Design a protein around this nucleic acid. Sequence first.
RNA 1: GAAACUGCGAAUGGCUCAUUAAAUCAGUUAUCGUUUAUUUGAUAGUUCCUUUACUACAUGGUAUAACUGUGGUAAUUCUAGAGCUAAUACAUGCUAAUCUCGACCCUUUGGAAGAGAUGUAUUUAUUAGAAAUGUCUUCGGACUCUUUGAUGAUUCAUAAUAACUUUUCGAAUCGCAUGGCCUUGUGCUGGCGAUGGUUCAUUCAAAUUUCUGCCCUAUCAACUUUCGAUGGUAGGAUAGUGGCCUACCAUGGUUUCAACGGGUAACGGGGAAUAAGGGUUCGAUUCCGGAGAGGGAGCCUGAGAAACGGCUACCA
Lengths: 137, 170, 39, 244, 347
Amino acid sequence: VQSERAFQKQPHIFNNPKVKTSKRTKRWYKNAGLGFKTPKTAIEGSYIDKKCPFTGLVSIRGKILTGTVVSTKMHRTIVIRRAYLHYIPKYNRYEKRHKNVPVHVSPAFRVQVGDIVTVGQCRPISKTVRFNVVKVS
Amino acid sequence: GISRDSRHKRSATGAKRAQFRKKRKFELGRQPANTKIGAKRIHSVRTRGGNKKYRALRIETGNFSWASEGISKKTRIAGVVYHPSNNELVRTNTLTKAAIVQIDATPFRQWFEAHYGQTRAASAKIESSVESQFSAGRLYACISSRPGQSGRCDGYILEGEELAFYLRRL
Amino acid sequence: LVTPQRLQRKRHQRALKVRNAQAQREAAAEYAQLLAKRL
Amino acid sequence: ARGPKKHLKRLAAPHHWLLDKLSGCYAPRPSAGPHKLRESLPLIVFLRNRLKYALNGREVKAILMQRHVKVDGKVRTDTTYPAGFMDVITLDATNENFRLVYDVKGRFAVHRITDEEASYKLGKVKKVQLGKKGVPYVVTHDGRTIRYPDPNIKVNDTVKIDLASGKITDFIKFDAGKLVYVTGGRNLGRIGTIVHKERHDGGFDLVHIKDSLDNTFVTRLNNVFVIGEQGKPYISLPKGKGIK
Amino acid sequence: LDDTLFKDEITTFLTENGSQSIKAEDEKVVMPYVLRIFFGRAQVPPTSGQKRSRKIAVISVLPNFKKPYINDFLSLASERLDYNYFFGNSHQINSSKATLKTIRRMTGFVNIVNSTLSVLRTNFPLHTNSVLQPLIYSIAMAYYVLDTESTEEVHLRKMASNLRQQGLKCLSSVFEFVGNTFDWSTSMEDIYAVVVKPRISHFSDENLQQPSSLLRLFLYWAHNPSLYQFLYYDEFATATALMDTISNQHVKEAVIGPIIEAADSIIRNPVNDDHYVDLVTLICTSCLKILPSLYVKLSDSNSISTFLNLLVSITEMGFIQDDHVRSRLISSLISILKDTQKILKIL
RNA sequence: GAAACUGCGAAUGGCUCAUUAAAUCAGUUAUCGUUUAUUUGAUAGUUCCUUUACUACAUGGUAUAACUGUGGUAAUUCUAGAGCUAAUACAUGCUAAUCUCGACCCUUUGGAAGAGAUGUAUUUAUUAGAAAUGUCUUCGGACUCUUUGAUGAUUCAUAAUAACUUUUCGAAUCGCAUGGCCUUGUGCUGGCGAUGGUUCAUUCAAAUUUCUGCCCUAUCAACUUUCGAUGGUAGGAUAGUGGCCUACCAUGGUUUCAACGGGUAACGGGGAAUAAGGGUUCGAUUCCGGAGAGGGAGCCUGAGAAACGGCUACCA
Ligand SMILES: [Mg+2]
Ligand SMILES: [Mg+2]
Ligand SMILES: [Mg+2]
Ligand SMILES: [Mg+2]
Ligand SMILES: [Mg+2]
Ligand SMILES: [Mg+2]
Ligand SMILES: [Mg+2]
Ligand SMILES: [Mg+2]
Ligand SMILES: [Mg+2]
Ligand SMILES: [Mg+2]
Ligand SMILES: [Mg+2]
Ligand SMILES: [Mg+2]
Ligand SMILES: [Mg+2]
Ligand SMILES: [Mg+2]
Ligand SMILES: [Mg+2]
């Protein structure tokens, strides 16, 4: 977890060594709302992610989308593919189209290429990432 | 000359973007303030709106908090020891947030004897490492403020896992 | 120059501050009484 | 633009003011105030194009500078002051008291009221929060911040405000069967009783309203204004009683 | 002297072991100047946040100083207060000195001592002439003004009242920090006469609600064996007054708990003198009579336990040998039934 | 009431369509991601705290314009030296309170011996923010307990503890008028307004931002990444999110569902013409939104500008 120059910690969560009441490091978490069950892996996990929707300083608000994971080769985020049909009126016919959306995935989720993920909008995480995985299936 | 605009950057696809418009004031940036240890020099900066930002060009004293004891004292900042982002800042003793720095231990020590009457005992017990630094006379602290914005260098004394990790890195 | 009008203005300002404080205290007491009624 | 705008084209002005398109090139831009720009009636339009007491802008200015016009019990001298919904306009010289309520057509109507009714107004509770020093307060649709409110008051309820003191005399909860006035959308101006409140988390809530004539319609919660219990409104209603 | 650079210089110039700190040889010449400088800053009226911080900074540098210099700083505070005449005579206040100016002066002195005690705590250097001697005089003035002054001068009566409140608090502070280290045999008689004695009559009537500084003073004497001579003065008036608080109908649970804890300490700390035997009999017999009513008033389980800790104490030293002690102990116990192992052992 | 200082405005209005091909723009979202002059509504008694050796019946030039007078230049909405004088300019700085309990009397319209408590603003750390089914009573009532709010959702609203600050604010301002108490003092008190001021909310707004939608071209098939391209973390900067930039890391991101590159006599839309319907073409042009002020670049002021009927350089 401390695989870096800088120490990873949940901000403003203080662990008083003197009291030493419990072995486990105190961990702060929240529920994201809209009936999205926070997985237990987040509650009893040890990872630290400022962009996680359940333990980080990020809120899910706005559109909620669903897609299929197309790429998962990059650190803590994936690329999903949303497919749809665009309507051409002149020919009165449909046309298959698609768009790639990069989405941040918290380590609390284990996502493979091919599974269906429901993602919620959040504040701009990176240059292209504006969504956060909130449910996997 | 400094701008934060995203239009000059390439698109996600790899396409580049033609100049949509001239640079705007509401998307500006200002020169970094490499705060360094020394006699206090701070000058104000008029920012967007009527607000003001304080720029710390030099500073030598700052308020540091002992969280375990729940106290805060004003102490002299001696020198920068380790900075995670970049090490030439450590070389130049540049002060910024998250920089690990060394502070003199006299005020905390004096408060320790005053409160607990010891250079009761169970409460007076502290970490072995923290006592070792007291014996040294110098304490490792992490700066929690942003000197380039607020003009302060507040921080907190390292403890427990923080202190152990940074000692391993040192 | 020191003139009676300046003294009158100063006295009025002080009286206004006192009256505002008194009115705020009365409002706070009324709200506390209402909560006591509800509980 | 490099700053806030200060002009308004007549074609760009709100439709419901009913401004002649050929009279001129510009329309009165409402100044900042209790009500939003698009949901407000500036005093110049009300005094000139509705009551016809003034024939031109200069006459309206002369009327206002005489301090003959009171808005919610306070004298206003701004020609473009944004009077709005449930606003009380008093003209003592004419012995006239008006309440701004939209008609079935969807326009502000010249509705005369008695002094007793003019002594108060109704405000939709837009927000309830604790201020500094832990003092609770409510913010209404007209920008009034009222401290020490009743705890039972919540968002979307309606508070009866006494103009003289600016305090809460009574309140009406948002609940099924309550009498409701529509202040937005195509159903603007209609009156009906609540039937059901559809709640969608993270989205706009929808309210079903049923008129006296048995017709039903669905409107967003933001356009809803509770005005009393069915058959017993707390304010005199305009002609037609918000039907059709 | 410069206000903008005042606080930074205190850390750099005055901090112990500092690189820019005054050399040990030069301390004697420079420090007297430094004390006068800081004394001037300590007189700033704390009306704003910045001004409060400046006052805190001035008092916070004292631990850096060596104790003789710290004692010098306190002497400067007490120099203006004229106290030699009061203890020079048989502890009588001059009418001329009784003025709002003097009351304002002692108020400033007491506040500085309170701040110094908070920062130094156990390391606070206590001396008769520098600190304690003026301290007792100030509380004497507060009593003298309060009784003698007429109701018309409401402001003067208020200023005297605050001085007594701060003065008593300033006392109870110094007892708790340096009471044991300092030997009070010399000043014990004056302190009782000038502070404790005048208020002894009503002490029960005054402190029913919450513990007061004067009550905290008596408790501190009850706990420490060396200071029992205070409790011996004037036929155990101070001790007798403690139980009159207990004997009162309207004593609350906040005041009740500490006193029985203090009574237990007196009961559990033997002292070799005739007065101690008389005291414990007065402590014990007085406590036993009122205890059943006391139990009803308690609302805390811990407050229940401390009575049992007192009851079990009385059995250990054999006071239960007396029939009256045994009977009243039994009457108190049946109320408790009307910890369990402690009760059983007592039975 | 000329002139001048101060305050505000001059960032609106008007004109044009050069650049711009997921850009602008249309519809639709978000700010739990941030600034907001102004309008509107609320909002600030901190009593005390030693040199009281004391201005608040009110402090300075730490100061100048207009003005007087002596001058330079061919010339400009150019200005130098000397002498003056004001503030809602500039810089300083103060003046016997309220609230908890309340013994004791007294039993209420009660008195109060006494024990206690005391603004804001910035920075950091920490903390809070979740079988009383009885008894009596006058039949009423009393006896013990409760004790934050909101969102779908938060480290939210709010409060508390310890310190911190070249650190702010907490009225040294103005018009009209002369009422009320008396111990008769140029004593005490007092009306209606104007202008300012901290914080919150509202309003006019601004900046980013979610999803979908653009003409021709495949005889443009691979593109982006050395000089940031994709993401991680930490810092800097920003009003703020963010590779926006910096340091170290991984090797990523788009594409035959047409990426990338090329053309466009390409500002987009509401709309206009034609057509029986499908369609095809036009839209600089009365409204909305974007950009520009000969071409690039950078800036002071201010809430708001990369301003051009504002400023500085370079090119012509
Ligand atoms: Mg919402
Ligand atoms: Mg192109
Ligand atoms: Mg787009
Ligand atoms: Mg204005
Ligand atoms: Mg001159
Ligand atoms: Mg960052
Ligand atoms: Mg780099
Ligand atoms: Mg073109
Ligand atoms: Mg066009
Ligand atoms: Mg236009
Ligand atoms: Mg422009
Ligand atoms: Mg030209
Ligand atoms: Mg320009
Ligand atoms: Mg021009
Ligand atoms: Mg222009």
